[model samples]
Target: ERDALLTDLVGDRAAEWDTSGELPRDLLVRLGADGLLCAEVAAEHGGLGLGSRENGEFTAHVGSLCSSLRSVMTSQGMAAWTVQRLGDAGQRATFLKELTSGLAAVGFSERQAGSDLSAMRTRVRLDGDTAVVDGHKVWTTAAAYADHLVVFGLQEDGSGAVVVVPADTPGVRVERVPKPSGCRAAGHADLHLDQVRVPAGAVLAGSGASLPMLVAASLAYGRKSVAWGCVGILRACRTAAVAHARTREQFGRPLGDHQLVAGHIADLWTAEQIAARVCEYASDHMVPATILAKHVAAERAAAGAATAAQVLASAGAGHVVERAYRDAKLMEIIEGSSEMCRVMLAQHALALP
Candidate 1:
């Protein structure tokens, strides 16, 4: 019953939510009630216990429905998965439970940090039984309504890890940030945490040892989902472009009849196909394939939308095609930004050495 509703949500409300810039709190609550929030969570923790591939497919479907909603789901699923994977039993039970239950939100992203964990300036320190956190995080999604957050910070030990900060934590403030045009259902904000303090036990640990691996693992999981979402967006643009070309006319014929229009559409399809394959491969390999997929999809979404807009110029320029153009640009800028994706790809390809 819930899956059926989510399917409807993808088709109906998702796009509207993205366009309206209104937080789809009602949709989120419905999603939570339907247990999609815990769809990927392990069965051991009162979750569905799905695997990475399944989660990726779900994310793609959501992306096809609405990119913003997919982002919200991605962040929530990522945070829940992270705590379950790396956190102590108590921490997982406390924090992840809320996430899986749709009772809290998880925040990630920084103005200075884009796909570069090394650039994170937010700092954390240990004071025996307390963990003192200090830093400002930019573009924090859902901070305004989240019950808890997984905020990344450099520890006193000179290691980077996400700290679970309750929304009510002292010195924590959630401020509005510049939002993207299409993914408004997913809240993005600038979060300030000044000397915010959390219990030492709140810090997720691993064998009292390495935890960075957990962060990497969580991102890997998320990238797969994002890749699927990108594919969906690309597919949406292709569909819209084709639709526009068929109906609109120029020179007493269909707009798609023109050689240039045909060429642009062909290129758009080709680019989208290549990006889809890349996403498929990434989902298969379990690496940072998101870097490549993100860049490819973002570029293609922008290009395809532009081509679609150009073709529609003679008929009428400012409708669905225009919205697609703006939405494509929005998708590219959000979720780590296109520039960051390029750099990540470069780093992964070892082109930088």
Candidate 2:
């Protein structure tokens, strides 16, 4: 009864992986084989068939082991999630078995279209049964490792869509981004698609959908994954702070004996618990709550991770807490930025009363 599949695989190498900017590719595939990388796809598609809550907690487990792995996990899951949510029955049957079989990354953002997707310039057009795509995607998580990229671009009908482009296609390019601040080993890359052509069948059937509509479907999945992942970050930092406080000494006494250090520990614990509980409660209302969960968890995670770093000092910067601090800060920005999330919340508040 493996409660978590990828934890043992991660073991103790997260720091090495973080500093070097590479997750062992073989390890990622092994988790893919176990159906852990994109676990939400149905069993019919050769996946573990985890529901939302189970899959989310599973995401947290991986997130704690290594944020980079979780980042890759998010990409894989988002690719499959986009395919499943946005596709027709024929489309669903087409991609799931293939995407579930190995790594795939979603291409939703261009350099100019980070949050404002309306600014996108990528274009997709059909020629008989072939699809021609020309676009650029920036900081596409797991792109360096993707066998297929679910590329997003504007279609002939003024809609945006996902196209399944093989990475080795003639005009498709994958260039790794250098020196990322956090989750450095998640295989982030920029994709350059210049007149890349694929069979029209490779396009998800939802190709004619509104761009914002398409994004909302994708973001719902990502918001939860990152939010749950943040809970794990908080978990790791709290544990990092506590373990250091108990063992490390200052002024001839344990760091825990110092009032400020003890307060930080208390704050860390509270932050972790709050993040976890918020995630759990958000399960039923995952759409709205996922946004709230991410905003709340991200805020707490950033602060709590800093608290962990404060407690560890040089020891923290040298290793674990340091990574958490950098990764947690990124959480507030990706999926939906904290600024955008607040605006959405306020928009909701105004609409209600």
Candidate 3:
């Protein structure tokens, strides 16, 4: 059902959107209506209430494209989950409906800070009844088409706050960034907040200690989605490699007859098993386990894509395996880079708590 639904919605347009660097807003609307955007929202708020496990599976189903649509889903899912957990009654009432319906984005990364929230320079000051935000954010996914943006910034008290703003609010500027090679059609943008103001009620303030927790939650969900998305990439790689090895004749027999080719297939199978187990473990909300899972899945995806590409060498750059190769490479950098994960893992290993 998931595969059929995705093929029906994205079939040939995925490449077109990626090449043209244009977001498929119409298709995204369909995903929204199908309850795939914010799949975790409560039924009372019009969401499907799907859990992390289902989210991973759904993301995997769509991971072949792995860029335009998946990035939008990731951003919106993170924002929706944060709002549901942190927003006050009024903010939730105002934003949850649109978020679950796929009309929001989150501006959580800045050029200077990269993925380190502690280094963020964006500041939000309470000005009478308004909260004024001033900062610049880069690599914000789906900001162009979103109705709202959940921006993270430092509050006057030097604590972190998640501020929800209408996309068209004054002093807010969104500029399209260079299309990234992998998630080309995500419509990633640079958000310039020049005194962007919203009602104080729109800000979800957290203490210094709580800020790390918020970041962890966001990273956990983001990595979980990408990990499962890579599962889809791995599946694509295996399917393509296996199909080629069976029929592509060489040395008077099918390629699968070769011992070396069989090794690649074996590696692909092992990767799939490892990714599946770790993916299940991620749903348990174990931070260290999730980090390790994402690291392993991303590494395996890249390796699997390469193996598939080698198996389908004659098929050229336009082939599915080729595309998967490119997408898998980008998966390494999302949520957290492999090196970053290693650093965190090392800290945990050393009992650095």
Candidate 4:
């Protein structure tokens, strides 16, 4: 139930912000410091160490209220996860703690490198005290607010690498994506750099390791978070659709009294429940399950939101349902595209006896 406090905080304002293409800056930082943005950080890092189940639930709650915040929240968790898993002890001790203090983002976007790692053309290499980076990364969510950027690409020496670069480096440029079709307040941007210089020490522990492994581990968190966020979308749309249908009159009676419109309510409820159940399974053995969860959840959210559009009719012009309608589409494109997810899931299915 997205009521009272959350409603008080967000309510009709999200629509205003969505149109403005902005989310509050200080709240992102404040929430991060409070351990609310990335709640899964371990206790040693001053986090609650929420398990996937708990984090997933909270994530959905946030998503339901504001996917704009959820996008930034997902970025925070993915960056912290990358640092914790790939950073050295010193790096983790430093970065992960501070990651909770400010906004950070990860860059895996490429013109062509979807599921194919070898197709990655942006390259990096280390020499002396500076690592040289040159590449363009598009659609970097949260890049507009990131204080640090975790960029992954191929090493010049034919290995995979991850570089933790300060976002203000001289040669780096973050171009805000203008008028984005969805998640407008998420601060999506594209990264452009030439001869970008980062401290050699800033390279993650996997600098010379398998890039796919780095991407897989990082994207697993991204996938799970996205799935949970989509669950939130499903919930918001259902609540709005149901409320509208029950109260608003059409013809001579309430909209729900019409058998056809009531069927949409059932579909929306089923979509929300099924998406949530799949997300719950994502709390375990998520390597394979996350793929299914994200895939199924996104498909359902997109379709369900459309159903919400129809059920809500003109009543849906409000921000909550309409915003969900837009945010749900982006869910289909991010993490792993539905097509790529299917290919990977099928590969897993084929590998199992």
Candidate 5:
């Protein structure tokens, strides 16, 4: 029932939203109402309490419509899980309830600090019982849709801390960036905090190395979700390309009969199977395993999407192939870029010796 509902609602409109770069806020609300968002949050917090494996499967299924939506889900999971695990009881009670009905964003990267958190210039100073934040954040996903952001910044003492900043706070400014090449519906934004203030109690975790401590477990879950979500893109690409090849004809014969066309279908088929297996394996082992899974799935999905686009070039706009090709690029960039993943996995290898 849940699957059918999402397919009916989102599948039909995915193409339109992708083109327009605007996803209805109600659609996200509906996802929450259906209990489709933040599956990893415990049942006590009004979540479904789905396990890691189940969460990945659910994310993969949703990826078929729009991977941008997964951005919202990822942010929600990050905030919900962090608060549940580390927040004071009052913090948990406030944010978890808000999360159940609304969206949240993640503010990690800065204009000057791409993947390096140490260079982050965002600063949070505690004054009395309030936390004052000032910084510029770029590439913050779903900021336009979020009620708050789990923002990470350095404290006045050079300690890192993750704190919740309400979207409507006094000094919070969210500016929409140019529409991206893919996942347009995800609504990425630039967040500028000019003396934004929240309760000092909003800190999640971080002392010196703020980002690593705050992101450790949540990042694993985020990567796992992206891995499975990429699989959905792979699945859609494979199915669409195969279906088109079997029926569409070129040179007075079925396209599938063409050797080159057949090869594209073959590669996509292999990618789908491999992605599924990798996602399942990552589910069993969260951190490094999931990181590896995300790397492979994103790369393979991009390749498969390219193949699908080439195979279905003759087809018109809104074809599954074209959309998947656009969406696949985001899979590689988000959570961790392909290069970042390689570095992370290598560090693990070096640590063993």
Candidate 6:
């Protein structure tokens, strides 16, 4: 049921959506209508109520096998979970419930604020009871067509809080961003939150305090799902590389028959073994570990996918291969950038310089 929806959307127009850098509005409606927009939300709120472990496994396949659809699932999943875990019942029923039905989208990660959340510039001011928000949010994965957006901002007191803003609010504006790299069907956009106002209740995890926990929940889940998506790209790389070695002929024998080619393929296989296992392990413990399994998997996938695409270069260059190459790089940047992950993981592990 979960997969059926993804299969239907990711296979056709979703692919086209990615190719054209367009929004997957049609796909969202399809997913939303099916009660699959947010599968892991608790059933009380009208969701599948699945746990993180089960959801992570499902999302791994999504990120790996169905990039476009997976992007939607990851964002919605994170948004829904963040609200459900941290927000009051009213917030969950109204907003998180809508997420499970595709009534909302998340604008959490911005171009300038990727991973380094401490550097975020969006501000929330307490004016009587409503919080007046103002700032520019870039790299919002979906905003153009969402009924609502979950945004992160710093309060005037320097405390952080996640805010929910109606997408159609007067001061809210969204524009599609051009990414030649990845998540083509992702409905990515840039937002300008100028004087947008929300009731004090709109602050997640309640008034002045609950921001950090919700943020942690979102990031931990987001990173876990990213690990799963890395698996798909790595698998695709291996499949394409192996096929080229077996069937693609160079001179007389297969292109893979050469010593250098064989060595390169072997290296990719070895590296991938480590990457895939590490990614799975990370996802398994994303919540319990309170840490990522091995943040380096994104780095490995980016490198591995590139090499995999190179192995298939003699095939006259197809869109799939080109897309995979760019997709790998995009994964490296999504959820959390590889460079930032290194710093975070290092600090968390006490591996400081």
| Local distance difference test values of all predictions, in order | 0.68, 0.86, 0.79, 0.86, 0.80, 0.69
Q: Which stretches of candidate 6 lie over 4 Å from their true place?
A: 1-5, 12-15, 108-115, 210-214, 256-259, 286-291, 316-318, 351-353
List the candidate 5 regions with Cα displacement exceeding 4 Å: 205-209
Q: Top model by TM-score, which number?
A: 2
Cα lDDT of model 5 by residue, 10-87, tens digit: 767777887788889998877765557788776676777888778777788778766777667777777687677667
* lDDT string, candidate 6, 1-353, tens digits: 66554555465443466667765567676676555647677787778877655676566556655566667776777777678767887888888667655556666555576666667778878778887888888867656567778888778764777788888878888887766457676777888888998887787765356446546767776676667666666666776688889898888999788988887788778766776677656545444342354355677777887787778775626244566677778877766676767667767678535
Q: Count the backbone clashes (under 3 Å) in each candidate.
A: 1, 0, 0, 0, 0, 2
Count backbone overlaps in model 4. 0
How far residue 64's Cα lies from its native spot in candidate 5, in Å, is 1.0
Off by over 4 Å in 1: 1-4, 10-19, 103-108, 178-182, 207-215, 314-323, 330-344, 347-353
Q: Report the error of model 2 at residue 128, Å.
A: 1.6
- Please give the TM-score that candidate 5 achieves against the real structure: 0.94
Which runs in model 4 stand beyond 4 Å of their true positions?
A: 1-8, 115-117
User: For candidate 2, lDDT tens digit of each residue in 1-353?
Assistant: 34344666777889899989999888878777778878889998888898877888888878888999999889888888988888878877877787666588988798999879778889889889999999899999999998989888889776787788899999999999998988999999999998998998888886887888887888888788898999889888888888999999989999999999999999999988888887887876646777889898999999998899899898876276888899999998998899989998888778875
- TM-scores of the models, in the given order? 0.83, 0.96, 0.94, 0.95, 0.94, 0.86
Candidate 3: clashing pairs of residues: none
**Residues 169-205, candidate 1, lDDT per residue (tens digit)?**
8899888656555556568778888999899877777
* Candidate 2 clashes between residue pairs 3 or more apart in a chain or in different chains: none
Determine which window of 10 residues in candidate 1 has minimal summed lDDT: 206-215
lDDT of 3 at 145: 76
Q: Write the per-residue lDDT of candidate 4 for residues 1-353, one digit (tens) a residue.
A: 32344455565678777888998887788778877777899889888788998888888878888898889989999999988988889999888888766589999877787556557777788889888888988888999999998998888775778888889999999999988999999999989978898888888886777768888889988899999999989988999888998899979899999999999999999999999999998776658998999999999999999999999887776368898889999899889888889999999999997
Minimal lDDT window, size 10, model 5: 204-213
Write model 3 residue lDDT over 66-85, tens digit each, in one string.
45687788877888877877
True-structure RMSD, every candidate:
3.5, 1.5, 2.0, 1.8, 1.9, 3.1
